[PDB]
């Protein structure tokens, strides 16, 4: 409804906005399509411009900044003067800037604070993930390093954390959204899919590092059969770490719902805890599309499958 840019208000030009995020996505993504007459052409929107989308929030019905990022790419058509943007929050910067860091044994929160301090990234008070990580040397992107240590934190019994940018970097635990919205009331169509596609019933740990930690921790072998994996990570250097990694991998296969909603719940985001029918599910992916009729589509799943796949 309001698109601030730097100074102007280009909400008087946009054909539609689509706010999309994935649980493992690089960044909260806003793809706003505009018509580009002389008026919009004058201001000369370039890549790197700062877009802030403001719309009436679902919670309190007050205008709140639902998106605050930067224009990552502009594509302009000439025959039809339709300028199209693809906005990203500043976690896209972290996913592109490579750097090598050597880390001793420590927790994920300390590592994230170290990254932010090194690269001068503003950040709120980061939640203590608690889990203690093994010494590693990293080379991938900063977001890649953060995701790697968060995955290793999900292993060893730690809670599932996800990093979202907003104005200043936030360490967002998955099941900690304020409002557990119920989608059954506006359920245009749902697609309950169940499978054994990524089911894990057994896991045979073969430790590449010593405390000779080896074991098997089959959990539902009698019911679904011995759907076995082999976890052979150097980071597992402990018997309890092996047991917790095994326990953080068992699941009954893929179990998700491809939900389609006729009303756009504005504040939904990846990782949020949302209800369909009596059950509760975590948002694997959300794709708003703020056309003339607000609309939302969701892909949600159980905790076990999400932990198995994305962690």
């Amino acid at each position: 409804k309001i698109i601030l840019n730097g100074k102007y208000d280009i909400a008087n030009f946009n054909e539609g906005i689509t706010l999309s995020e994935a649980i493992d996505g690089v960044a909260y993504k806003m793809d706003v399509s505009l018509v580009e007459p002389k008026q919009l052409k004058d201001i000369n929107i370039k890549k790197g411009d700062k877009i802030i989308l403001i719309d009436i929030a679902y919670e309190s019905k007050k205008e709140e900044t639902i998106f605050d990022g930067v224009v990552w790419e502009t594509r302009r058509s000439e025959k039809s003067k339709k300028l199209t943007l693809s906005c990203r929050e500043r976690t896209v910067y972290m996913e592109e800037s490579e750097e090598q860091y050597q880390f001793k044994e420590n927790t994920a929160t300390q590592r994230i604070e170290y990254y932010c301090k090194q690269w001068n990234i503003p950040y709120y008070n980061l939640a203590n993930t608690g889990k203690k990580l093994a010494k590693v040397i990293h080379k991938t992107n900063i977001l890649d390093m953060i995701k790697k240590d968060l995955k290793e934190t999900a292993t060893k019994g730690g809670d599932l954390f996800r990093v979202r940018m907003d104005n200043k970097l936030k360490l967002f635990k998955l099941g900690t959204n304020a409002n557990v919205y119920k989608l059954d009331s506006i359920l245009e169509d749902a697609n309950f899919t169940s499978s054994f596609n990524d089911a894990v019933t057994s896991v045979k740990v073969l430790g590449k590092s010593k405390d000779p930690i080896i074991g098997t921790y089959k959990k539902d072998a009698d019911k679904f059969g011995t759907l076995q994996k082999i976890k052979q990570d150097e980071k597992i250097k402990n018997a309890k770490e092996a047991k917790k990694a095994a326990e953080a991998m068992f699941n009954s296969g893929e179990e998700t719902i491809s939900v389609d909603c006729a009303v756009d719940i504005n504040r939904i985001r990846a990782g949020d805890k949302v209800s369909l029918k009596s059950k509760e599910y975590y948002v694997i992916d959300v794709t708003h599309t703020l056309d003339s009729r607000p609309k939302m589509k969701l892909n949600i799943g159980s905790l076990e499958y999400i932990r198995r796949k994305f962690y």
Binding site: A22, D24, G25, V26, K29
Partner: peptide, 24 residues
Amino acid sequence: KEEMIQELLSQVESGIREALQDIG
């Protein structure tokens, strides 16, 4: 009658490229 092919090939290319860039 024929522009549907161009339109939806563009949509397929954009969607798959977009997903690969996001997840990758």
